[PDB]
Amino acid sequence: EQELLELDKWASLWAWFAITNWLWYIK
């Protein structure tokens, strides 16, 4: 099994910060 201690579960978080796809809503 794999909980949130594996780098994979934490890897999606590093990608989260760069979620700058909501900035386009503000033209």
3-state secondary structure the chain: CCCCCCHHHHHHHHHHHCCCCCHHHCC
C-alpha to C-alpha distance for 25 and 13, rounded to whole angstroms: 22
Q: How was this structure determined?
A: NMR
C-alpha to C-alpha distance for 6 and 3, rounded to whole angstroms: 6
Maximum Cα interatomic distance, the chain, rounded to a whole number of Å: 44
C-alpha to C-alpha distance for 16 and 20, rounded to whole angstroms: 9
C-alpha to C-alpha distance for 24 and 10, rounded to whole angstroms: 26
Q: 5: which 2 tokens?
A: 């201690």
Q: How far separated are the first and last CA of the chain, in Å rounded?
A: 44
